[PDB]
Design a protein around this ligand. Structure first.
Ligand code: BCA
Ligand code: BCA
Ligand code: BCA
Ligand code: CA
Ligand code: CA
Ligand code: CA
Lengths: 268, 264, 269
């Protein structure tokens, strides 16, 4: 890849937003590469989870404003946004639809599209040095990157509306209180903690994960009876899968099902 | 009488006790059949104003009764049992959500898998300080169910729903309360009585009004504002037409419904 | 003009004041029509940037105006009345949610039944430490309405929505804030002023952008991500096309940075 950092180890496909000089804003090319990378992860039997993080001390500053053409008129501007907006779309959608759990490791500021990415991921943790901001209004653009889908689904309509309208910066503590992030860790221990959490996610049963993830997205909008129908189909498939019997055996042999799949350290 | 569950009717409350204490109150097929019947019966009963679901002893419900799974019939034997069992979990969960009575979940201890499902499907939930919640699905190796794909996010939001399930983390009362999973937490020793009082109060409150609110809440989550108001309006109209209305008004003109103690 | 509500347009804010303080600011049929009218007018006024709904005195709104219900005409009379007033509660509530302007609910005191509905239908909500919230329906013997089956769970989650309704408990500011029912709480004596500045800040902010966000938030709650992004993109494209865009971009590149949020909500208590 030439615009993103990418590495697969320990069952984790790690995608790094890398444009640190410009606060990890996402270029059109980079977005194409993240999506490709998400496609490849889903196709890799050796990948159990995906982790998205930023290079250095920023997560992602959102739209790459420095690539917008300024010498071609409104047209040039409209044209650029049609293309970049399509890639923000492709990528955000892939994060939500990919058949792998995605951990957003928020190591610094997440603005605009950056916040969009954080909201689209399955799990999210951040460094105590991280921060979140809508930023759309500041730059005079209508909000996107599925913020009309994700934000309210996580924080409720009221907080979603306030954050977008006030445009204020949300800090770790509050982000955690809001459900935006599950846990916060000292900056210095952040990377290590996050990689370990990703390895666990990767080691846990992908099949079950995917069933949970797809159902969560779909179920939000379905009535109970349709929900159960789809869940039951998953149940039947899961107990037919070779993974099951051995777990039952263990349970019957005294091993408790409250054993965690992923251990999230307390953090701060 | 029932053979796999505890069941009492007192002070307008139909108390359903999940009773398989030696096995942590896991729900057997038979039991689920009984629970559902009990729910139907309560709704058919003019004397019943509310339903209470609770577990026997110190456990709420450990979920799927795994000791009921046949091991001498191969994979198909397993599969066939789940089809039946899952159908029953389904009939029960749906009923809790659709029954025309308020349903109080009195979480007296551990709620795992289907036990958590029950907790989430209920109208109101309170737990003892000794209770805890765990998905279990991802460790026991079974795809999630018991409408967790419906109720969990509606309660705690998508992020927390996904986290809980994925990590298989155990949620203790203080966080469960902060999350909204339970409304109040009470000391283990005072628990049953607090719960009984709350239930008696719900039973006493106007059933028709409760049903209207219950049904609307479920439906409205998914409807546009204009459709929600048409349904609410129909409810208002019917309500001011009901005998209960006038007396309330005059009393108002002339000069809480359920008291949830603060707990811990 | 208006004879049943307080109203003004100043500093870009259309301020609607619920005014029936002897009666705790309950809403009469006539005031409801006026509130709806004023919302319509705000939306058509180039001079208005935001709307603020507040109560006169020490109450926000006690809901349905009970003293309007005909006791002399039996059942059909009572019902006929409810038919009309419910319609107006409805037209009003709908408008708050659909109006093309950000609406701030400045809850200066008690919000009961329909008053609670108004506060839930608004886009932003802040309250005085002296305020309180209560469903009240279950007590007066009426089915819940005013879009509570829409707004409440969207805000506080389904469990807390259910709870509040069923217990008919009174929610105080600290808890309402914890729940997300209100964003901030301010000392009673400071309230009016804080709220008025928040409204002015909301009005000064770019309405076009505000509207886009508001419409997508309501719509998107019920739509799949692919459908959400398509509508979002339509707004992105219209927004960078609009004259306001370029100046913001240039400034960013130039090194200009905002000294504060578009809308500042002071910490409060
Ligand atoms: C990220 C910051 C808070 C960091 O603050 P600082 O630590 O003070 O760094 P600086 O501001 O000095 O920036 C450092 C250098 O990086 C550059 N930089 C930072 N962010 C960007 C972006 N987004 N693009 C290009 N260059 C950037 C900055 O110009 C300097 O050069 C600040 O740089 C910032 O506010 N960046 C702008 C954030 C923003 O407006 N992003 C766009 C929001 S809209 C959007 O994301 C979107 C996505 C998809 C769509 O279809 C439409 C819109
Ligand atoms: C619940 C516990 C954490 C508490 O255990 P402790 O308090 O330490 O108790 P013990 O493990 O010692 O249990 C004591 C005895 O009860 C027995 N026990 C406990 N739970 C169960 C269940 N669910 N089934 C059968 N026997 C059980 C256990 O084998 C011991 O004998 C633990 O017992 C546990 O892990 N039990 C298994 C829980 C589980 O995996 N339930 C199924 C999850 S999936 C599910 O609910 C489901 C719903 C509907 C569907 O269609 C599919 C799946
Ligand atoms: C608001 C209170 C909690 C506090 O009042 P207090 O501060 O102690 O004052 P008082 O009770 O002495 O009231 C002062 C005077 O106001 C009068 N008052 C207060 N509220 C009202 C209402 N809502 N209507 C008529 N008169 C009222 C009260 O009768 C006294 O005279 C109390 O006045 C009260 O509970 N009022 C009734 C609130 C309520 O029942 N409103 C209706 C709930 S249903 C509803 O809103 C609705 C909306 C739309 C629909 O289609 C159907 C129903
Ligand atoms: Ca995995
Ligand atoms: Ca009742
Ligand atoms: Ca404005």
């Amino acid at each position: 890849y030439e615009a993103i950092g990418h590495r697969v180890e320990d069952g984790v496909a790690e995608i790094t937003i890398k444009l640190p000089r410009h606060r990890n804003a996402l270029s059109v090319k980079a977005m194409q590469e993240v999506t490709d990378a998400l496609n490849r992860a889903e196709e890799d039997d050796s990948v159990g989870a995906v982790m998205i993080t930023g290079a250095e001390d920023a997560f992602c500053a959102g739209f790459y404003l420095r690539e917008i053409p300024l010498d071609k008129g409104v047209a040039g501007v409209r044209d650029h946004f049609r293309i970049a907006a399509l890639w923000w779309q492709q990528m955000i959608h892939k994060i939500i639809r990919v058949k792998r759990p995605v951990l957003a490791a928020i190591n610094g500021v997440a603005a605009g599209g950056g916040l969009g990415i954080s909201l689209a991921s399955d799990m999210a943790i951040c460094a105590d040095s991280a921060k979140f901001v809508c930023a759309w209004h500041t730059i005079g653009i209508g909000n996107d990157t599925a913020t009309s889908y994700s934000l309210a689904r996580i924080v409720g309509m009221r907080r979603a509306m306030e954050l977008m309208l006030t445009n204020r910066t949300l800090y770790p503590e509050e982000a955690k209180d809001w459900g935006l992030v599950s846990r916060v860790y000292p900056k210095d221990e952040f990377r290590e903690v996050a990689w370990k959490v990703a390895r666990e996610l990767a080691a846990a049963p992908t099949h079950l994960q995917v069933m949970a993830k797809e159902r969560f997205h779909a179920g939000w909008m379905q009535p109970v009876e349709e929900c159960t129908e789809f869940e039951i189909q998953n149940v039947i498939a899961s107990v037919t899968h070779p993974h099951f019997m051995p777990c039952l055996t263990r349970f019957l042999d005294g091993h408790r099902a409250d054993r965690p799949q992923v251990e999230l350290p307390a953090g701060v």
